[PDB]
Amino acid sequence: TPNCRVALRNDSYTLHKILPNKVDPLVSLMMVEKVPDSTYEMIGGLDKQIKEIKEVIELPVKHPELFEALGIAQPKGVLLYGPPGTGKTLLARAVAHHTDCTFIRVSGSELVQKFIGEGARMVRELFVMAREHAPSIIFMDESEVQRTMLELLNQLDGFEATKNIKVIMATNRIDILDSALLRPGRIDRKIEFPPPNEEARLDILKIHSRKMNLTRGINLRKIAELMPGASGA
Amino acid sequence: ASKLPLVTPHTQCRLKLLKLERIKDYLLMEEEFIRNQEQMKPLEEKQEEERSKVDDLRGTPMSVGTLEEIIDDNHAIVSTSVGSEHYVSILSFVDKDLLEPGCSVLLNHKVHAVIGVLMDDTDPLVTVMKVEKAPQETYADIGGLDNQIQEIKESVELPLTHPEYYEEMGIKPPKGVILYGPPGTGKTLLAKAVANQTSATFLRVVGSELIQKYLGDGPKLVRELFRVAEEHAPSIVFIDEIDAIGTKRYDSNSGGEREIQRTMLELLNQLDGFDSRGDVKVIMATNRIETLDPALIRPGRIDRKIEFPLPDEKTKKRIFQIHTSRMTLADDVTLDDLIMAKDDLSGADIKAICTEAGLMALRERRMKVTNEDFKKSKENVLYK
Amino acid sequence: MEEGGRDKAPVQPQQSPAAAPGGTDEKPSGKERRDAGDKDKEQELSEEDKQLQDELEMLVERLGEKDTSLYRPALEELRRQIRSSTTSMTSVPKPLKFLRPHYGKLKEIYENMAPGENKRFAADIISVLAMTMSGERECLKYRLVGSQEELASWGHEYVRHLAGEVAKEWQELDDAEKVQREPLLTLVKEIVPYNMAHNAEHEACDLLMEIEQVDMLEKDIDENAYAKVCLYLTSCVNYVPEPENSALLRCALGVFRKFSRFPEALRLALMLNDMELVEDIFTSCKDVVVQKQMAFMLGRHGVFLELSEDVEEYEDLTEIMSNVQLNSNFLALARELDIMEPKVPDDIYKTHLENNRFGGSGSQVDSARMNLASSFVNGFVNAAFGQDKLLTDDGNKWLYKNKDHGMLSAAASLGMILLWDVDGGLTQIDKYLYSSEDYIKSGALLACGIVNSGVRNECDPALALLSDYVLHNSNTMRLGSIFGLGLAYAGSNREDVLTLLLPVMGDSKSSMEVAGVTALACGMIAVGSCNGDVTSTILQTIMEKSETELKDTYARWLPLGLGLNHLGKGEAIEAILAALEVVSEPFRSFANTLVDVCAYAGSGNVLKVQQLLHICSEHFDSKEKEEDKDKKEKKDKDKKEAPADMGAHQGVAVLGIALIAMGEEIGAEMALRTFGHLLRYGEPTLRRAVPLALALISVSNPRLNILDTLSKFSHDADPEVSYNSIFAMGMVGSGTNNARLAAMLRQLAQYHAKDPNNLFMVRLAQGLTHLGKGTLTLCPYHSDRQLMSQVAVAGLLTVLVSFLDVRNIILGKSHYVLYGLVAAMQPRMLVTFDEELRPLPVSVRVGQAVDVVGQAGKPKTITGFQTHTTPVLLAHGERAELATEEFLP
Amino acid sequence: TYSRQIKQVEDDIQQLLKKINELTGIKESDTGLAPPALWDLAADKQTLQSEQPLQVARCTKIINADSEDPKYIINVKQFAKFVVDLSDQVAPTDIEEGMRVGVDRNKYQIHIPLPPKIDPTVTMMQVEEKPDVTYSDVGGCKEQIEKLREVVETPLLHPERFVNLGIEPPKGVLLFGPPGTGKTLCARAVANRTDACFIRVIGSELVQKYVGEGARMVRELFEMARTKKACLIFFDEIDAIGGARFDDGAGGDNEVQRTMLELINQLDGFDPRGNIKVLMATNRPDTLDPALMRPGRLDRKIEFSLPDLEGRTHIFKIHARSMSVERDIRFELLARLCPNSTGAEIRSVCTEAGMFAIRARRKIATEKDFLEAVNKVIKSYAKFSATPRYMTYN
Numbered sequence A: 001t002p003n004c005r006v007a008l009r010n011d012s013y014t015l016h017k018i019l020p021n022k023v024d025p026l027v028s029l030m031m032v033e034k035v036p037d038s039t040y041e042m043i044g045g046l047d048k049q050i051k052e053i054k055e056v057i058e059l060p061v062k063h064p065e066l067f068e069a070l071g072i073a074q075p076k077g078v079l080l081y082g083p084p085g086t087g088k089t090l091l092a093r094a095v096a097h098h099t100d101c102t103f104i105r106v107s108g109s110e111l112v113q114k115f116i117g118e119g120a121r122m123v124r125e126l127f128v129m130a131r132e133h134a135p136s137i138i139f140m141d142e143s144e145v146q147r148t149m150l151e152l153l154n155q156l157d158g159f160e161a162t163k164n165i166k167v168i169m170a171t172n173r174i175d176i177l178d179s180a181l182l183r184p185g186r187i188d189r190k191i192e193f194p195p196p197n198e199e200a201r202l203d204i205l206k207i208h209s210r211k212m213n214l215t216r217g218i219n220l221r222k223i224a225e226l227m228p229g230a231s232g233a
Numbered sequence B: 001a002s003k004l005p006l007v008t009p010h011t012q013c014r015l016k017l018l019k020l021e022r023i024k025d026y027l028l029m030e031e032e033f034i035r036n037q038e039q040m041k042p043l044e045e046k047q048e049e050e051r052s053k054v055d056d057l058r059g060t061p062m063s064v065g066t067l068e069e070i071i072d073d074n075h076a077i078v079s080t081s082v083g084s085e086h087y088v089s090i091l092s093f094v095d096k097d098l099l100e101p102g103c104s105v106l107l108n109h110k111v112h113a114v115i116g117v118l119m120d121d122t123d124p125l126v127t128v129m130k131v132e133k134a135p136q137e138t139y140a141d142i143g144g145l146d147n148q149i150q151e152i153k154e155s156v157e158l159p160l161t162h163p164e165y166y167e168e169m170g171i172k173p174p175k176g177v178i179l180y181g182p183p184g185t186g187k188t189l190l191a192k193a194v195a196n197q198t199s200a201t202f203l204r205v206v207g208s209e210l211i212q213k214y215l216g217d218g219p220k221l222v223r224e225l226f227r228v229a230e231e232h233a234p235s236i237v238f239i240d241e242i243d244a245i246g247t248k249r250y251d252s253n254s255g256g257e258r259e260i261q262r263t264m265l266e267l268l269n270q271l272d273g274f275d276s277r278g279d280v281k282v283i284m285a286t287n288r289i290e291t292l293d294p295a296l297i298r299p300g301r302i303d304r305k306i307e308f309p310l311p312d313e314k315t316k317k318r319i320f321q322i323h324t325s326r327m328t329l330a331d332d333v334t335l336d337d338l339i340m341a342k343d344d345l346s347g348a349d350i351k352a353i354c355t356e357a358g359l360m361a362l363r364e365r366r367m368k369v370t371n372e373d374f375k376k377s378k379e380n381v382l383y384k
Numbered sequence C: 001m002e003e004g005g006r007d008k009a010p011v012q013p014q015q016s017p018a019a020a021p022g023g024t025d026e027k028p029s030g031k032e033r034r035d036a037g038d039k040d041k042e043q044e045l046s047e048e049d050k051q052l053q054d055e056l057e058m059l060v061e062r063l064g065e066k067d068t069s070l071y072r073p074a075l076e077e078l079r080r081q082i083r084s085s086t087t088s089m090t091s092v093p094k095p096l097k098f099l100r101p102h103y104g105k106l107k108e109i110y111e112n113m114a115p116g117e118n119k120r121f122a123a124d125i126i127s128v129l130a131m132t133m134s135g136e137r138e139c140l141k142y143r144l145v146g147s148q149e150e151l152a153s154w155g156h157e158y159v160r161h162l163a164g165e166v167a168k169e170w171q172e173l174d175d176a177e178k179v180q181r182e183p184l185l186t187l188v189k190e191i192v193p194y195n196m197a198h199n200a201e202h203e204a205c206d207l208l209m210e211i212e213q214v215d216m217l218e219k220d221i222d223e224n225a226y227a228k229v230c231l232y233l234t235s236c237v238n239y240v241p242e243p244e245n246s247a248l249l250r251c252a253l254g255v256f257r258k259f260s261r262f263p264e265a266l267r268l269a270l271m272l273n274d275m276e277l278v279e280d281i282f283t284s285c286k287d288v289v290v291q292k293q294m295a296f297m298l299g300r301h302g303v304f305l306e307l308s309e310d311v312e313e314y315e316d317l318t319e320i321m322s323n324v325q326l327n328s329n330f331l332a333l334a335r336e337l338d339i340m341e342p343k344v345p346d347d348i349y350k351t352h353l354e355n356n357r358f359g360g361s362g363s364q365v366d367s368a369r370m371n372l373a374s375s376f377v378n379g380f381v382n383a384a385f386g387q388d389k390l391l392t393d394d395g396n397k398w399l400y401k402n403k404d405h406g407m408l409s410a411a412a413s414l415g416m417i418l419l420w421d422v423d424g425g426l427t428q429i430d431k432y433l434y435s436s437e438d439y440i441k442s443g444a445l446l447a448c449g450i451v452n453s454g455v456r457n458e459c460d461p462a463l464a465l466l467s468d469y470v471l472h473n474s475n476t477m478r479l480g481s482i483f484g485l486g487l488a489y490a491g492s493n494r495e496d497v498l499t500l501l502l503p504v505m506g507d508s509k510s511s512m513e514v515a516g517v518t519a520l521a522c523g524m525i526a527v528g529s530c531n532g533d534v535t536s537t538i539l540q541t542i543m544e545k546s547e548t549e550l551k552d553t554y555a556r557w558l559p560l561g562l563g564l565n566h567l568g569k570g571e572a573i574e575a576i577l578a579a580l581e582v583v584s585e586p587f588r589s590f591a592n593t594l595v596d597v598c599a600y601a602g603s604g605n606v607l608k609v610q611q612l613l614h615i616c617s618e619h620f621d622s623k624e625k626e627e628d629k630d631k632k633e634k635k636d637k638d639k640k641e642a643p644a645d646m647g648a649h650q651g652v653a654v655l656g657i658a659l660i661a662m663g664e665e666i667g668a669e670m671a672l673r674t675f676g677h678l679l680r681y682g683e684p685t686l687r688r689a690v691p692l693a694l695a696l697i698s699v700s701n702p703r704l705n706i707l708d709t710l711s712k713f714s715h716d717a718d719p720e721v722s723y724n725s726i727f728a729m730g731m732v733g734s735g736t737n738n739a740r741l742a743a744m745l746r747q748l749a750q751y752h753a754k755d756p757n758n759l760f761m762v763r764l765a766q767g768l769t770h771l772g773k774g775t776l777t778l779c780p781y782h783s784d785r786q787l788m789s790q791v792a793v794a795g796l797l798t799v800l801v802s803f804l805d806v807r808n809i810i811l812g813k814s815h816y817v818l819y820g821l822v823a824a825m826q827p828r829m830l831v832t833f834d835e836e837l838r839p840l841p842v843s844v845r846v847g848q849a850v851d852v853v854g855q856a857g858k859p860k861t862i863t864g865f866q867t868h869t870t871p872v873l874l875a876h877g878e879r880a881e882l883a884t885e886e887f888l889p
Numbered sequence D: 001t002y003s004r005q006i007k008q009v010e011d012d013i014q015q016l017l018k019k020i021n022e023l024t025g026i027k028e029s030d031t032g033l034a035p036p037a038l039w040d041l042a043a044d045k046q047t048l049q050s051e052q053p054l055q056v057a058r059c060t061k062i063i064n065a066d067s068e069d070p071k072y073i074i075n076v077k078q079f080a081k082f083v084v085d086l087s088d089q090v091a092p093t094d095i096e097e098g099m100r101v102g103v104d105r106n107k108y109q110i111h112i113p114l115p116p117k118i119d120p121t122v123t124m125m126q127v128e129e130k131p132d133v134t135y136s137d138v139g140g141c142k143e144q145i146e147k148l149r150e151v152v153e154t155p156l157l158h159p160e161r162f163v164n165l166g167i168e169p170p171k172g173v174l175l176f177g178p179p180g181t182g183k184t185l186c187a188r189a190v191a192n193r194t195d196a197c198f199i200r201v202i203g204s205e206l207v208q209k210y211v212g213e214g215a216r217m218v219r220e221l222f223e224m225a226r227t228k229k230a231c232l233i234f235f236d237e238i239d240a241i242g243g244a245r246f247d248d249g250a251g252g253d254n255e256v257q258r259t260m261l262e263l264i265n266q267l268d269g270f271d272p273r274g275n276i277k278v279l280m281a282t283n284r285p286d287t288l289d290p291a292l293m294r295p296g297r298l299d300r301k302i303e304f305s306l307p308d309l310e311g312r313t314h315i316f317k318i319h320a321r322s323m324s325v326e327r328d329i330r331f332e333l334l335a336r337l338c339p340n341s342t343g344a345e346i347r348s349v350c351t352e353a354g355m356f357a358i359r360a361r362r363k364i365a366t367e368k369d370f371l372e373a374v375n376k377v378i379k380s381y382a383k384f385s386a387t388p389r390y391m392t393y394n
């Protein structure tokens, strides 16, 4: 295989034996960042947003034929918004986890940089690893991100032909992001994350208290009413 | 291989019969002459004996080095992989034509003498900027412009497909093309139709990604962009959103506005330098046309200036016909109520309504799109 | 598959010809009226060329083929009406009734009797009826008859007239590009007796059209650019009267029956030179036709225009002789001094500049043979009135310093400086003639023949160089006096001074290098008659070369004048005359190949080219006939300059594979001089393949052999970017590639391309392709470089001033009587049209537009506009009269 | 008639070419090998002659010599420094200090001196090749050409009219005006006609990434230029390489000014450049530095103004001499319709009006085809116009 280790003799430099499988640079990139791997079973009270995020990302992989029956273009970009600490990251991590996607997040760092390329004069060199793990998902945190997303959305607008690549941006305060990103054909669906109410502060406590050693008789309902909607964090 | 380029009778003439029967004689006489070499001087196989003589000359360890100069009497200064460079000699089976300074070579292990050259594994930025396949549907997908669709073929397509019309006029085709208008009227959309049609290599770069973080790295990227464009073919360079080089300031760029300027001076060279340009067409697109430098928009660098208007209310009806072509449209709807909903809705607004109305159908597992889908579509798309 | 239903034709012509044996006997009406129903209905359903799937022509012969074999032969009482219904119906599908052995049995249906007026049912249809079959008649049937039984029965007699109207039928129906199919009809019919078919089709072409001449006209010369010798004999003399009998365009007579001059009969073009002086209307074509008769493809015409009308129409001759030559001096006088040229450019020696800092210091090269090359900072740059006054001080101070052969060389440089001159060229010599030296006067008086080259007026028929010659008891006075007059009178065919210089051959004086260039002098004069020259040459050859086995001074000089004496005829009689003449030992049979292929300059006779290789291919030849096999390859160097690019690609594909790749002595020593003979054009196919074997010097051989390929790879004229290939080799040629024998040579390479900026057309193709020899002045030098010993002593007579037939450069000249017009010109890459749509696009590089005396260039066809109509000569030839007419508003 | 018969006899002989050329050896499409019938010179002899007697001769750099003895101090890339000796084959003359030499791997002794390092980004900016622009294309500005041409080439083509009169002619010249006026075009005509080395520099190539990196490229330019006898340096768009020294507060644009000071030092003072002639060309000269505008560096100050009227009429005759036109059109009417127009616009008028002839059907333009191109180029693209904020050079 290309990019595979070998053994090698030294007197004549003859090939000896295949030495296995070192790492993918995409694997070492996610190993640096260490996203907190999540699932649907640790989601507290976000039932309507899970239905919205599946219609855009989950469905055009398992059933790409289902949009040809409607004859509309399949969506590409998702914007998530709300106050910080309300679960933007864990929802995006879960959706990639439950339909077998390579969850790639870019932050524009420089320890990351040595695995993408030597200089990477663009950001678009990220796609060479991304179209190799073809059903992948690009994720971006909270103005360098807003220029990074415009460069990606112009590539996957018709110029990129390899399908099943989607981008997800998470930020707060949508009234200050760029007007070029607020062109109505640009972002396919925007999803608001409210702070949780009394019914939704309860089950986040319920899921988190699974790994504590509890005493019988607690009445968590009284506890969740003491917090007047801080966040899910 | 390139034995005879003459085909011009193109019939059953004796001349096509005579020419190829002359070439029949030159071939067999060349055959029978070189047949007599191994008959009277066998002396080797020549299929592998001279080959294995070379293969036993060059060692099994083959180190890869790097040229940096050439002295013509078969010895040149080459760089090792460490940094300590040598003054080795060059062989005769080395085909001394593909030797540029910086080209990867093959050295000896013992005396490091120049054995062979190596094909380059290029590049992780050429393949970034080179559009591989044709993007999308044809010019029939656009609809409604019909005046500037003629204009772009006039400057790009017709110079390439019919190189006769300009010669009979004795003229050179117009050089540069810029596309400007309000946002979302189809500037990027028309460039996809050119990339559909053409046979030239098509290069695309956003204007935002011209700006860099190191000093002097910006103008270096422009010099190697037009290097790539010239070294292939007749080609098309598409630069999108070039107002973004000047409007937004980013703190990643170390130099301030007086590094943006030095980048623009290099681009201002590459369009109308004094070097022999070649066959490279340039297409540019923006929506803030009043912001950028008029020294770059002078005739000589950009010749044609194409304005895009907002869609008219009889051309809007054409656009609804296009984006609702292959969808199972229920007969509840009337498209004319949707036309004058916003007085100045772009072409991008129409596709944003048509896709989002289809998404409302899949929430209820339906197959056709009703009227109240579009009623709650424009509430979702427009008004927020 | 929708079969059935409408099957009328697979049923009723399946019934009625099947009932035709049932309705021939005892049914007299159905034998004819159903046959008349079978003749017209098969005729009517076949005429449209849109339904080629006829409903009978591929349907009736499933049984009708077995019917017709019992209908036509087995009836045996065929009448006079029922054969016009049989053979008009049964001879139509027979190219498709029969398979590929049709060719022996077209006549078992047709030659029973040709029914009437066979084109009556071949009117609307182009070639499906019988014009494909008429091609099948002349293909195989007429060829077996007309091989040794041309004068024969019905297979020739009506076949002439059957090929009469059918050849008229191609120019009858549509007048499409099927007009050029008639040269496919006239030539396949009676290939060698082409004139018996052409005389039937010359007079028919005379009444054919006056617009449908010109594309068939170029179609014939497309077939006449190469042919078999008897075909090239026949089709070119049939080519002549079509601009005379049908058309009277009549101005392409002179240059394009130089095509017909040497092969057919040397009197025949002289009978066409008679056709010049008959059509005396009036002056404009009359001036331009005889412009070329002096110094463009031959001379020797100045004795046929002193008739009784010597006023101006026959006083053109002296104006043809030297005055338009003086207008070709007025080229360099007024027009070339205005564009660029100063009196001393001199600075290609200054272009040898930056090696003093390229790697340290300089002031090192102090070779005295460099000063031989330093003669050409003067000598090469000063052509076309580059006259020098005290700028020859590099030639003045080296005249009186050393190098006796350079006293010859600096004095012979002055002939190139005042070139094409009669006015003051003699006067410039005399200020440096008087030195009382064998080497100064003999070099200066040899240059006196250079100055008047092409003048041939009274300068010295027996005056100056005969007085030089009769001084002889010694060195180059004996030698350098016969070279100049044979140069100056090379275009002459005068008998007298050839017999002044015939006892030079018959002296038997043992100065051998004089006798070697003696045959080289007289061979330049005549190419035809005077077999007593051939007697005079071979007698001293038997008297000297037989009683010795020594150097190529015999071999490079003495037989070379014989091939010039019999140049340019593919008759293969001169091979019988000269090769049987010196039947001898094989080193005197070196000249077996000399006079053989010098008669075979440009044609297609590739049966010569196989016997140019297969006799002595390699044979490994341990140092015996390597001069011969180099000379056998030397005669492969012609036959490739003018098949019009057809063998030029086929020669570069062979020699780079054959000789320099996988040969022993022919490739490594000599096989590069083809490229010094194939082209001085300049194209990177061979221009990049030669320094692969040059910059790799291969110093193990006699390394001046590769350095022989150094200077004469710079042999290409028309200066280019090739200074890069030479000065970089001139950089490594300073230390290495030693200056002790090559400092003359690397700059002789360098100063050669830029001789001046202009005056480079020495490449033997005029009009479009005719010869203009040319070859007689050049071929002695390429034979001379075999190999060594003349780079110092003997070849300096040749290596300076060998080729001097530079018929200079341009075609931008008006020559309307006042000389006031400039032009309206437009130069282009060469034309590509053979047969295309009407109007045919000539050429494709329209981006250049000029009006005045500008350059020629390598592949250039130049046309005009402005409705000047350019009505003079229309073909090419660089001195159009340029009349005008404007009847187009 | 012989439809297949010419075809398959064509096809097999086109195959019989390839079927035996595979039996000669051009094949095995390589990864860096030669034509096999070309390397036969080093096939047996120089294979064992250029390899086995000849050695590697690792190349070095010399620090200095010392008195009384050879005893040369040498230096290599990263390894140590030695004390070395010559061979016999070379004299001790051309082993001057600060010189690259080749050195064997065992005894460490000097074989041959080497040419110095050229720093190959300076190597690419030598032009090597000439454009096709003649002074006949620069019509309209004849007096500006003549005042230019007497500085660049007449001391080089005739270095005797100036010496015997006793004057040292000027050395530098800048060319400045509005854009599209003909500045870069007129410089191409100089490189067409000249003969010396013509080293071009675009001012946006000296901005580098490190500190003081750009000032070294200015030296290596003038190092190789002093080696040549005559040379012609061309600077284009030098408003990038330096405007003025204005340093305030945080030191900004400090790095480019050190490159601009090194360029000033190579032009004047202390054993000067000699026979090197420079030629700048800017777009807005008001930004440039007063110490750079000083004569002795930038003596001539050729202005490229807009053409008056007869300048414009001559430009139409250049860009429309080679196009199919109606005979009876007048250009003098056209030049009155373009009052302040550059030469670049007049070319675009001529190239646009030919397209109108290609729009419908026809083969030659008319007078009204020009007038339909005038109001589109001049009066409809007038929103941009590029000139009126550059006449004031701001």
Ligand SMILES: Nc1ncnc2c1ncn2[C@@H]1O[C@H](COP(=O)(O)OP(=O)(O)OP(=O)(O)O)[C@@H](O)[C@H]1O
Pocket: A180, A183, A185, B141, B142, B143, B144, B145, B182, B183, B184, B185, B186, B187, B188, B189, B190, B287, B311, B319, B322, B346, B347, B348, B349, B351
């Ligand atoms: N006239 C039109 N005809 C057909 N489709 C259109 C038209 N105008 C816009 N669209 C749709 O709008 C989408 C976006 O168009 P496009 O991005 O090319 O406009 P733009 O002006 O280039 O946008 P921007 O100004 O943001 O670059 C396209 O996918 C296209 O489908």
Ligand SMILES: Nc1ncnc2c1ncn2[C@@H]1O[C@H](COP(=O)(O)OP(=O)(O)OP(=O)(O)O)[C@@H](O)[C@H]1O
Pocket: B272, B295, B300, D137, D138, D139, D140, D141, D178, D179, D180, D181, D182, D183, D184, D185, D186, D283, D315, D318, D342, D343, D344, D347
């Ligand atoms: N006097 C003139 N005659 C003919 N053409 C001209 C003239 N002046 C300018 N041009 C045209 O202008 C173009 C070259 O302009 P040039 O590059 O010299 O502009 P400039 O003066 O250098 O300004 P910039 O630096 O912005 O390019 C050429 O296409 C040329 O045809």
Ligand SMILES: Nc1ncnc2c1ncn2[C@@H]1O[C@H](COP(=O)(O)OP(=O)(O)O)[C@@H](O)[C@H]1O
Pocket: A036, A042, A043, A044, A045, A046, A083, A084, A085, A086, A087, A088, A089, A090, A091, A170, A204, A232, A233
């Ligand atoms: N709805 C939720 N249910 C469970 N845990 C949550 C929820 N929202 C936030 N968290 C907690 O917040 C952390 C994730 O941070 P997150 O809120 O995703 O960042 P962001 O502010 O980008 O959304 C996790 O440790 C998780 O335990």
Ligand SMILES: [Mg+2]
Pocket: B184, B186, B187, B188, B189
């Ligand atoms: Mg767009």
Ligand SMILES: [Mg+2]
Pocket: B272, D180, D183, D184, D185
């Ligand atoms: Mg410019």
